[PDB]
Amino acid sequence: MDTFITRNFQTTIIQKAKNTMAEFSEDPELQPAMLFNICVHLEVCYVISDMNFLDEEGKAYPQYEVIEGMPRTIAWMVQRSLAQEHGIETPKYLADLFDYKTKRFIEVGITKGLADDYFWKKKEKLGNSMELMIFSYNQDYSLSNESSLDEEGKGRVLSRLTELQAELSLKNLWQVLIGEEDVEKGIDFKLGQTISRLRDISVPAGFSNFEGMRSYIDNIDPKGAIERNLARMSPLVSVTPKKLTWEDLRPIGPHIYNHELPEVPYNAFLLMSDELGLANMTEGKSKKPKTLAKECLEKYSTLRDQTDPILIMKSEKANENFLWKLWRDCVNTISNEEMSNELQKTNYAKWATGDGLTYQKIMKEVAIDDETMCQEEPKIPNKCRVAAWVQTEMNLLSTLTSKRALDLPEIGPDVAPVEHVGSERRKYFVNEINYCKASTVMMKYVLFHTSLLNESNASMGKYKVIPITNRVVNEKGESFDMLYGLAVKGQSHLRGDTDVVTVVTFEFSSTDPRVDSGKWPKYTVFRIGSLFVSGREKSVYLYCRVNGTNKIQMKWGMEARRCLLQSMQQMEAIVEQESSIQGYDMTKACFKGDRVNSPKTFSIGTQEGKLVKGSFGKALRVIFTKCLMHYVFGNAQLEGFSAESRRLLLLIQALKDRKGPWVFDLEGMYSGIEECISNNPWVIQSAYWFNEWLGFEKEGSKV
Amino acid sequence: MNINPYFLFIDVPIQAAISTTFPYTGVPPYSHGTGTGYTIDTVIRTHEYSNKGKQYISDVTGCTMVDPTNGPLPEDNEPSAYAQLDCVLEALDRMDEEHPGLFQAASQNAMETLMVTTVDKLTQGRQTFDWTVCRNQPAATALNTTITSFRLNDLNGADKGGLIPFCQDIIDSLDRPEMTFFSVKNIKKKLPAKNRKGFLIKRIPMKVKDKITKVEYIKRALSLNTMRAIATAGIQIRGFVLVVENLAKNICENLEQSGLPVGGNEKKAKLSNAVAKMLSNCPPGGISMTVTGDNTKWNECLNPRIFLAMTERITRDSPIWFRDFCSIAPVLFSNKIARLGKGFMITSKTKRLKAQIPCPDLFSIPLERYNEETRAKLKKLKPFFNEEGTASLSPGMMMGMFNMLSTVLGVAALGIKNIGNKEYLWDGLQSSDDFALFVNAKDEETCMEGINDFYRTCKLLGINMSKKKSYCNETGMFEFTSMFYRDGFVSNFAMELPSFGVAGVNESADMAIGMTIIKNNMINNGMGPATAQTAIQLFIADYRYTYKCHRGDSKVEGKRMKIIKELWENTKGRDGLLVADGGPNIYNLRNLHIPEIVLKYNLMDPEYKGRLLHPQNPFVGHDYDAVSGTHSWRTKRNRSILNTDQRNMILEEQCYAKCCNLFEACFNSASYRKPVGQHSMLEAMAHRLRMDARLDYESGRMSKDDFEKAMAHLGEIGYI
After folding, report:
1. Peptide bond before A265: cis, by omega within 30 degrees of 0?
2. Which of B359, B466, B476, B458 is nearest to B410 (CA)?
């Protein structure tokens, strides 16, 4: 088909048809029949307007103005100008040709059958406001006015179309030739009574029927209406511009400094800085989690065989006995021989997670009749002050440990300079954050959530024991299989994915909770035994906690591995900005330093109230830890606070660059930000750090 | 050393520092619950900002209607939905004069596209509210159900194929006195199931015919159901909104101010070009200011009547039928009825009970039994509530349904460029929710006077600028749709990142889809080389985990890994092996658009090439770019219930349970001894009993008398 199009027509005609039809906002390839029709129509109208010419008085020796082919905007404005200059009605459809003699717009068309019916239906479509000439492949012609075209033009057009018709059937193209009326089948659209009434009752105040609105829109000249409306508008409608200044900015959410409010609890799913993995060196083979947990407990047999618990702390509502018996059942199941990791002593599991205390649903009619059934008030989040453990979390998760848990596959050889730059950036990033404790915590988190999601494949009405395991590698190359504790997941009879399935997790730790009583108001902790590392006894506690999460939360935890890409993108944006200051890449220079440049240093934190600098590696580690904490501590409060602190930070930046920022309703922004600082540890610590950094910027801007 | 991450901002510009703060461009799982309470609050707020308008009673749907257009102008900075028609018409006139021949061309193109389009286009969409069952269903299923109901009601628009006949039949169906349709009804179960009693209860659906009066169908069609979109619209509205949005997109494409449908680095080019253009024509010695404005309650203030006025003004010179077709959508929206969802939940702690109150019975109980906020919300919503658990809602836009028209209105607001012939000129960009405004004047005082005039003007058009989320600064640094621009540098706030796992089609298809997704992320969202390479690494890891196709030279063990290791040992061209066969990955930035088969063809073993690309292999049998080989297999996709009538009538007879019980013993005594493959279960039983009798006699469990007795009975069966 397309070959016929490019062979039977000149390149200019094909290009004009293609660019005029591509404005339909659709694929021009899969439907080329209309392309052929439009090309033939363009050729016909071009031929029609190449033989007859006019003069100062109208000597026949141009007379035809071509509107099709040109851009629709230019064509429409030209048609409107012609109609205005000639004092004639403008056709509602874009006429394909205009005549200077008759002072009327005209249309052309191509068909396959008799042209009389086509002409009559086109007349019905356009009424009598436009003239037409029509030709058909089967030697038929129709003209509204016999004084429109001469014999030469009609004969040439007829010969061309007859030749095209004859040639089409030679390559089996006439069979697939679509007609012309199909593209304009729908021209009748009559509204029913109901829809007409709905339209009539949907007009702005001041009109009775939609006819009045239509006439008002099509007739009235509203020039100058905006000024008239604005003149009488009250002066009270003002943005109230206010130039911003350094002193205008104030600390956000000072209540967090109120010592009366309680400390923020530790609501993260898994222990991050207090983890304790029972290392068990392995060759490197992959084994089922149950076998790994069994071997790890066998190595530390003393902890496994602990039956008398030395309770150290208790939650407000949880029962220590039930949790301990559930943990004993979990370890018994882990240490058995059956392949399945399914609990068989469902008693304590059922009675420990409060799975039997759920209310029973009754028919709505009884509730309506009943008077004691009333909606319960929403438990709005409490308000808490600064929690000192978030600072320790951030400090420790950014340190370099002796083990790494990242092993990514390989990539093809790098050739292009951009590939070399990307590979260098990746090398520096991984080298910097390979052993960072945040990476290991992130891997544990994602692996545990993946296992939780997998266990929900077919087991939904049964309790499943899942060990919190991890695969780690050290500098020497020997790889270990760490076990961080266990967790039993309950049943979710409902098939919904956003339905909480209660899971209770027992994680080992080496930190005595009594040191920070406010850090664990939600944990039940025992003391199982004592490990020896360098001949010295260090205690081991078992933090037992009930929790509730849904399948979508499992998916979120699984995707929590995106913190790596997030941190890499942030570092790459920093490097791209540094390189954009210059004209060349700044990766090695800002990491290691070249002859011209020096190793870039970033302000990391505070030491005894004084600023401290550090290498770009420390900044990368802090960025990764911040991203991981943001993902782990994520709730609606955190995202809202970040979204509003965006605006506050942008205003501060504008202030720094001496751009003279102006604020309209500053207190509105401050209220929007403070609306989200209620109980999230990450949000509260972010507010504290923002206040500290704002103070530092204020005190440093006076120099 | 207490870390302080914010200190990074000291050494790095904040625009770069906060780059990619949110890894997700979609929706989190912990967002404030969007249930009946949220939709009630939305309708309450929509009616609150327009309560000074004209309140009347619809004579068609019999619901309360509020019309704020041409209402009193605001006397306070609070959000207002009172948009004067004259100001909107003048703004459209100014836009048309500035861009001559734009509205006519856009309307012509939209009408031509509508003429050439087909009903199937409606199937490309998110969840759609099906009215026959009154739920949320896929677009294809909703369209099929609507077509079937129309056919039952002597409406055959889909038969003609065109979209115009379909919409004509929709508006005609809006006129039938009684509408008959199909619906699905669930009935409990009594068929056996082996848990501990061979008996279980479930729900089985059946198709039934239901009729509804005219008013009921009218109300149902206008209903908006709720599942950051807040609600979805049925099929009766989809075609008209599609046409109107196509028109608005045609207009916007040629509007330099419009920020849509730009995507990719073109967005950065538009941003920088706008900044440069505004700075170039700044008055000599004047000041240029930039506002990163935001709009509060954007869709809770725009009125469908104003959109109707805009559509009428745009299509002022067009065929009357097309004008009506364009107008059918705004009028449908002006009568939209919201559905409040599931309902509330009320509990009694003393008796440990809870119950769910559905929307129709929202007011069936004293308001004192609802908490304070719900009590107040119901008290305020009482006037705009219907007895059928739905709320009348004339104003508002319930998030994005006329985003293109919203952008057109914003561009119209930005096109005035002056009020009172003062010494300020404004312009900027806007994409359907957010606008960046650049104003050039002599001194900052005149720039702020111009900003105030623009604020008042947009107030007159119903657009409410956010004073609590907007700021102004010297031009050169600003934001536009989560894209920070700063003196040439450009950064992103939230970037979508590849999700864990493979696409979910097959080995080669999944690899191709992953690579093309990475390429598209690089092209559009601006992912750096290092980030893209790390994404490639992560995708390879996930792919290998999912397909158990680790490296052939690795030391991992698996059912497929033994054959992979053998192939790796036997192969010479180890660089040519595909990743799916434990080979080495070679993908990188320069070759993210080449299928791995084409990449490795030159290195593949000729025998391996023949085996892999065998023209007739049993796996392949009968977007993205890949190669059709033995790795393009298809997974079994056959589930659910077929032969519904026969199975239902069999299960409803009686003796099915006895047949199952007899089948269970014999065919579960052994794990698999079933001559499956369409064998009649009676035939399989006959064969099984014949073999059992043979074995019993051979081992001596039965005497010859029992043997012969069994063979005679089996002789009567017919398979012996």
Report:
1. no
2. B458
Q: What is the DSSP annotation of B234-251?
A: -STTHHHHHHHHHHHHHH
Mutate to test the interface with B, among A201, A228, A243 (most CBs of B within 10 A): A201
User: Of B258, B251, B248, B255, whose CA–CA distance to B435 is shortest?
Assistant: B258
What is the CB neighbour count within 10 angstroms for residue B381? 18
Q: Give me the residue from A284, A659, A671 closest to B474, CB to CB.
A: A659
Strand pairing category for A464-474 and A479-489: antiparallel
DSSP letters along A482-514, please? EEEEEEEE----S--TTS-EEEEEEEEE-S-GG
What six digits make up the tokens of B575? 């660089």
Q: Roughly what angle, to the nearest 10 degrees, separates helices B163-173 and B102-116?
A: 90
Burial letters for A462-487: b for 16+ Cβ neighbours within 10 Å, e otherwise?
ebbbbbbbbbbbeeeeebbbbbbbbb
Give me Rg for the CA atoms of chain B: 33
Asked if B427 contacts B273 with a C-beta cutoff of 8 angstroms, the reply is no
The amino acid sitting at A58 is G
Whether chain B has a CB inside 8 Å of the CB on A35: the answer is: no
Return the structure tokens found at A317. 């509502």
Are B526 and B485 in contact by the 8 Å Cβ rule? The answer is no
To the nearest whole Å, the CA of A683 is away from the closest chain B CA by 13
Place of tokens 């508008």: A233
From A202, A565, A652, residue closest to B334, measured CB to CB: A202
Binding site members of A: 41, 68, 96, 107-108
Say whether residue A127 is in contact with chain B using an 8 A CB cutoff: no
Structure tokens at A500: 């909480």
- Residue A474: strand, helix, or coil: strand
Question: CA A190 to CA B169: how far, in whole Å?
Answer: 10
Interface test with B, best of A662, A693, A694 (most B CBs within 10 A): A662
Residues of A in contact with B348 (CB under 8 A): 370, 372-374
The kind and range of the H/E element at B289 are strand B287-291
Whether chain B has a CB inside 8 Å of the CB on A553: the answer is yes
Taking the CA atoms of B548, B553, B556 and B561 in sequence, report the sign of the dihedral they define. Answer: positive
**Resolution to 1 decimal, in Å?**
3.3
Q: Is A689 in Cβ contact with B354 (below 8 Å)?
A: no
Say what the alpha-carbon torsion angle B51, B52, B55, B61 is, to the nearest 10 degrees.
-40
Contacts of B152 (CB under 8 A, 6+ apart): B180, B181, B182, B209
Order the strands of the B223-225 sheet from edge to edge: B232-233, B223-225, B337-339, B390-392, B385-386
Dist CA B565 CA A372 (whole Å): 70
Residues of A in contact with B220 (CB under 8 A): none
CA distances from B637 to B505, B579, B634 (A): 12, 25, 8
- Residue numbers in B near A130 (CB within 8 A): none
Cβ neighbours of residue A349 closer than 8 Å, sequence gap 6 or more: A326, A329, A343, A463, A488, A490
- Using a 10 angstrom Cβ sphere, with 0-12 exposed, 13-18 middle and 19 or more buried, the burial of residue B715 is exposed
Residues 6+ apart with CB under 8 A from B356: A361, A364, B342, B343, B344, B345
Which amino acid makes up residue B161?
A: G
**Does the distance separating the beta carbons of A189 and B455 come in below 8 Å?**
no
Q: Inter-chain contact A576–B538, Cβ cutoff 8 Å?
A: no
Q: Which residues of A touch B330 (CB under 8 A)?
A: 202
Compute the distance between CA of residue B390 and CA of residue A357 in angstroms, rounded to an integer.
35
Q: To probe the interface with B, which of A93, A94, A237, A397 has the most B CB atoms within 10 Å?
A: A237
- A692 with B65: Cβ contact below 8 A: no
Helices (H), A9-127: 11-21, 33-48, 72-86, 115-126
